[PDB]
Design an enzyme around this catalytic site. Structure first.
Site, PDB file in Angstrom:
ATOM      1  N   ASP A  25       0.815  -1.379   0.006  1.00  0.00           N
ATOM      2  CA  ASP A  25       0.089  -0.099   0.134  1.00  0.00           C
ATOM      3  C   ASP A  25       0.820   1.418  -0.157  1.00  0.00           C
ATOM      4  OD1 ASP A  25      -1.954   1.849   0.098  1.00  0.00           O
ATOM      5  OD2 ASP A  25      -2.508   1.194   2.056  1.00  0.00           O
ATOM      6  N   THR A  26       0.857   2.012  -1.044  1.00  0.00           N
ATOM      7  CA  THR A  26       1.756   3.157  -1.235  1.00  0.00           C
ATOM      8  C   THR A  26       1.059   4.449  -0.455  1.00  0.00           C
ATOM      9  OG1 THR A  26       0.654   3.538  -3.506  1.00  0.00           O
ATOM     10  CG2 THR A  26       2.909   2.731  -3.482  1.00  0.00           C
ATOM     11  N   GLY A  27      -0.136   4.192  -0.155  1.00  0.00           N
ATOM     12  CA  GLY A  27      -0.911   5.333   0.356  1.00  0.00           C
ATOM     13  C   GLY A  27      -0.988   5.138   2.085  1.00  0.00           C
TER      14      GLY A  27
HETATM   15  C1  LIG Z   1      -9.907   4.725   0.071  1.00  0.00           C
HETATM   16  C2  LIG Z   1     -10.610   3.461  -0.045  1.00  0.00           C
HETATM   17  C3  LIG Z   1     -11.248   3.192  -1.553  1.00  0.00           C
HETATM   18  C4  LIG Z   1     -11.921   3.257   1.072  1.00  0.00           C
HETATM   19  O1  LIG Z   1      -9.691   2.251   0.170  1.00  0.00           O
HETATM   20  C5  LIG Z   1      -9.207   2.056   1.199  1.00  0.00           C
HETATM   21  O2  LIG Z   1      -9.215   2.787   2.413  1.00  0.00           O
HETATM   22  N1  LIG Z   1      -7.919   1.125   0.983  1.00  0.00           N
HETATM   23  C6  LIG Z   1      -6.993   0.642   2.254  1.00  0.00           C
HETATM   24  C7  LIG Z   1      -5.812   1.330   1.934  1.00  0.00           C
HETATM   25  C8  LIG Z   1      -5.406   2.581   2.777  1.00  0.00           C
HETATM   26  N2  LIG Z   1      -5.026   3.742   1.979  1.00  0.00           N
HETATM   27  C9  LIG Z   1      -4.856   5.160   2.897  1.00  0.00           C
HETATM   28  C10 LIG Z   1      -6.088   5.774   2.430  1.00  0.00           C
HETATM   29  C11 LIG Z   1      -6.238   7.319   3.103  1.00  0.00           C
HETATM   30  C12 LIG Z   1      -4.753   8.069   3.130  1.00  0.00           C
HETATM   31  C13 LIG Z   1      -5.036   9.222   3.760  1.00  0.00           C
HETATM   32  C14 LIG Z   1      -6.143   9.449   4.526  1.00  0.00           C
HETATM   33  C15 LIG Z   1      -7.322   8.694   4.504  1.00  0.00           C
HETATM   34  C16 LIG Z   1      -7.204   7.664   3.959  1.00  0.00           C
HETATM   35  C17 LIG Z   1      -4.812   5.194   4.218  1.00  0.00           C
HETATM   36  O3  LIG Z   1      -6.036   4.784   4.637  1.00  0.00           O
HETATM   37  N3  LIG Z   1      -3.693   5.164   4.858  1.00  0.00           N
HETATM   38  C18 LIG Z   1      -3.479   4.843   6.300  1.00  0.00           C
HETATM   39  C19 LIG Z   1      -2.900   3.568   6.581  1.00  0.00           C
HETATM   40  C20 LIG Z   1      -2.675   3.341   8.134  1.00  0.00           C
HETATM   41  C21 LIG Z   1      -1.349   3.850   8.636  1.00  0.00           C
HETATM   42  O4  LIG Z   1      -0.513   4.252   7.848  1.00  0.00           O
HETATM   43  O5  LIG Z   1      -1.184   3.862   9.688  1.00  0.00           O
HETATM   44  C22 LIG Z   1      -2.611   6.005   6.648  1.00  0.00           C
HETATM   45  O6  LIG Z   1      -1.505   6.023   6.136  1.00  0.00           O
HETATM   46  N4  LIG Z   1      -2.807   6.820   7.875  1.00  0.00           N
HETATM   47  C23 LIG Z   1      -1.936   7.657   8.212  1.00  0.00           C
HETATM   48  C24 LIG Z   1      -2.324   8.961   7.796  1.00  0.00           C
HETATM   49  C25 LIG Z   1      -3.685   9.411   8.487  1.00  0.00           C
HETATM   50  C26 LIG Z   1      -3.768  10.333   9.482  1.00  0.00           C
HETATM   51  C27 LIG Z   1      -4.917  10.697  10.175  1.00  0.00           C
HETATM   52  C28 LIG Z   1      -6.086  10.419   9.578  1.00  0.00           C
HETATM   53  C29 LIG Z   1      -6.259   9.570   8.540  1.00  0.00           C
HETATM   54  C30 LIG Z   1      -4.952   9.023   7.914  1.00  0.00           C
HETATM   55  C31 LIG Z   1      -1.737   7.570   9.701  1.00  0.00           C
HETATM   56  N5  LIG Z   1      -0.711   8.207  10.335  1.00  0.00           N
HETATM   57  O7  LIG Z   1      -2.846   7.190  10.520  1.00  0.00           O
HETATM   58  C32 LIG Z   1      -6.749  -0.622   1.959  1.00  0.00           C
HETATM   59  C33 LIG Z   1      -7.891  -1.353   2.410  1.00  0.00           C
HETATM   60  C34 LIG Z   1      -8.241  -2.880   1.780  1.00  0.00           C
HETATM   61  C35 LIG Z   1      -9.287  -3.525   2.175  1.00  0.00           C
HETATM   62  C36 LIG Z   1     -10.273  -3.161   3.202  1.00  0.00           C
HETATM   63  C37 LIG Z   1      -9.930  -1.701   3.805  1.00  0.00           C
HETATM   64  C38 LIG Z   1      -8.953  -0.951   3.484  1.00  0.00           C
END
Ligand SMILES: CC(C)(C)OC(=O)N[C@H](CCN[C@@H](Cc1ccccc1)C(=O)N[C@@H](CCC(=O)O)C(=O)N[C@@H](Cc1ccccc1)C(N)=O)Cc1ccccc1
EC number: 3.4.23.16
Lengths: 99, 99
Positions: A25-27
């Site tokens: 996951d690049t995101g």
């Molecule tokens: C956007 C849709 C279409 C709903 O797909 C997903 O969520 N796909 C998921 C990839 C996740 N990609 C990113 C999308 C994203 C990016 C930024 C904001 C909101 C959403 C993500 O959530 N990444 C998280 C993964 C957890 C992690 O890395 O610790 C992330 O980097 N979060 C950061 C940034 C963040 C901070 C605060 C709030 C939200 C996000 C974090 N440090 O918590 C995989 C998946 C597969 C099967 C079932 C459910 C989910």
């Protein structure tokens, strides 16, 4: 190798003596694994994504083998739907996006 | 081009006459954009990620330009923290992961 995205980019990882399937996951800044029996010490943490926030246990210097490449890094364990390999480990195997 | 992952993989997209910044996400099946005014019709839908589920409006056949490549596909609009370009559009620009 080169992986196209017509299907989810799932790979086999070996972590803690166990074999699992994870999503490249690049995101994701972080690597999050579903509930798992990991060993060693940790500290609480919260992460957010599309639907909200979850609490995960954070383990540092964990050995993980992704498609044969061994890397050591932080892994977060908690109630995630899928195992996700984030950028903290992807940079470690020299993974890039190309188009 | 080739994008490494030491930083978040953010790109400039042009959609609906507006310029925005979006995250190239291999772990997203779908493309989700923050609230924005889009023309054409739609249908409700729910999506999940780490955290839970959100409701988004789903627009089909939307023209979007990602780093200069024009593609037409479905775009989901709703309360997402960041704009995410998922695999439905990434396959369209022939984007691959490499390591
Ligand atoms: C956007 C849709 C279409 C709903 O797909 C997903 O969520 N796909 C998921 C990839 C996740 N990609 C990113 C999308 C994203 C990016 C930024 C904001 C909101 C959403 C993500 O959530 N990444 C998280 C993964 C957890 C992690 O890395 O610790 C992330 O980097 N979060 C950061 C940034 C963040 C901070 C605060 C709030 C939200 C996000 C974090 N440090 O918590 C995989 C998946 C597969 C099967 C079932 C459910 C989910």
């Amino acid at each position: 190798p080169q992986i196209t995205l017509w299907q989810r980019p799932l790979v086999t990882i070996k972590i803690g003596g166990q074999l699992k399937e994870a999503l490249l996951d690049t995101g994701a800044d972080d690597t999050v694994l579903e509930e798992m029996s990991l060993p060693g010490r940790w500290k609480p943490k919260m992460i957010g994504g599309i639907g909200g926030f979850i609490k995960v246990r954070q383990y540092d210097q964990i050995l993980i083998e992704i498609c044969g490449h061994k890397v050591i890094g932080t892994v977060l364990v908690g109630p995630t739907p899928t195992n996700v390999i984030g950028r903290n480990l992807l940079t470690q195997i020299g993974c890039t996006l190309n188009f």
